[PDB]
């Protein structure tokens, strides 16, 4: 364990490794609760599973004029269109994914597949993400995620498209399929393995207990998961997130999201280089209250970490799967 | 429908670091503490006692992220598992002996002292390391735990990621156009005016066209200058002055001590300092988190982490607001 730098081939980034160093179940005023009034005056149904609605304060609208063409190579702007939705995971405000049952989480997975299929018919990128915890600026504790679909391929998606396309041309295999194969051989960064899925701490991880979740089968997009794969996803997510809560015995904050092959038009397109995966980016470092700050050097030079990915994976493997 | 950047959503390109951003336009510290290890006279974690310094003070970080000696990792057996060596030194630089001052509260001569110390440490460590990263982390909101006025300096044997991104873009730009990227960018922003914050004889501050943080700024010299030590005395005095004006505007924006991370980017140093770096232009970035008040910040989370940076306030609105703020501190 000596200081060194490690490369992220998926997003083309180096990281410095300095190894040498109470929510009520229901609130009629919470606009995500069953029966509650949203900002546009609509009343939520008495839903008993997941619930999808249009964000009343959306970052993207479906209609917008395009900016003019760019008159200078340093001042480039392009059009942007999209739709932003909110997805409640469960009717109870006082539950989170790790406290939910496997069938309930399977309902979440089914709703993720449905909204990807639905919005993917019109938009080339559908970004599902969850922002969990006030530490991630989440102001509403009801269990949910957001879905932003966009007419442009976002920056990170462009980076992963570029690296995966390059990797499959150079080596004949999808980047993340070879990565899964290798981490199964190497063992030391695995967190969980199941029949259809694996969870690991990536070699190039930047956040302390960051994980990568990906299926064992080559799968380009979330809707292609079979029922067995979806149930197994629900199970393995429940185990991962329960480990996360047990790490510091608290409701573990994070941002997470799904990356799969671009949607929109598929005619004349080849996405075999893509592999479906999810990233988890948790801020906590040493306790329920001591976090990692991505500031200063990390903003001006390069991401930095003290805990090695292998130490983090070793700690995550040791944690119980029974919630505290 | 006619497009208007202040009215309609769009995406903008950062050509310096090759990044797109979504613009959703449609939306008490005691002066002295004997136990504060950055104060004059105080004891540090390694047992050393600070001198009774009356200006800046430079010392080795007692908890450094980089050490000057380290073994190199083995060669990689696989293209997905690449590791390289890392060596460097981490220093801490106090700006001033008084803990209750910040840069905008200091006099121009005192800030000029900071500039001179930045140049000295860049020259000294740059003789041995190809990258010397000066940066300041100001405010608990940026995880700074010590309110004493200071910055850090991490010098490294490797060229850090962001530096590689800016080396690549500036090299390409000068190859294609025959001028340094940021020199043309400065000329253009002087012509376009709408994103300027401050102009002085030798320097300018603007909200970059592609900015991601709400009141983010870019500070750069009007002359083509590759590295900080090359600034003349007049350029250094004027840097001190314009920084005092910028940081005072920042403090006046929400009438609070404005948090931020900031740092300097210059041509790589080390063994190849004598190579051709004419495509480089010295500059500084300011990345402040505050969004709408002294307490309401931007969170770079969720979509920003999984897809793309996003902002509501346009760079032009931010710059207009900054230009209107007084240069006299509240
Ligand atoms: O009445 C409302 C309240 C909140 N919201 C939206 O719900 C979202 C909650 O998402 P999360 O806290 O990740 C959030 O984007 C917020 O703007 C509505 O769409 N309508
Ligand atoms: O005794 C000490 C206390 C703090 N420090 C170091 O001072 C640094 C202060 O830097 P700022 O808060 O950006 C910080 O990195 C901290 O580790 C020492 O080097 N010796
Ligand atoms: O030196 P500090 O204040 O202890 O550390 C702080 O600045 C460093 C450089 O940006 C970061 O690596 C840390 O995340 C941050 O907490
Ligand atoms: O949707 P919210 O909770 O209003 O907003 C939050 O999630 C968004 C998507 O990551 C971010 O752009 C915001 O910075 C964050 O505060
Ligand atoms: Zn990804
Ligand atoms: Zn820069």
Numbering used by the authors:
A (entry chain A): 28 to 48, 64 to 366
B (entry chain B): 22 to 48, 64 to 366
Provide the authors' original text about this structure.
GALT is a dimeric β-strand rich protein, belonging to the histidine triad superfamily. The eGALT structure confirms biochemical studies showing a two-step ‘ping-pong’ mechanism that involves an enzyme-bound uridylylated intermediate. Inherited mutations on the GALT gene results in autosomal recessive, classic galactosemia (or type I galactosemia; OMIM #230400).
The hGALT structure represents the uridylylated enzyme with a covalent linkage between UMP and His186 at the active site. A key discovery from our structure is the presence of only one metal binding site per hGALT monomer, as opposed to two in eGALT.
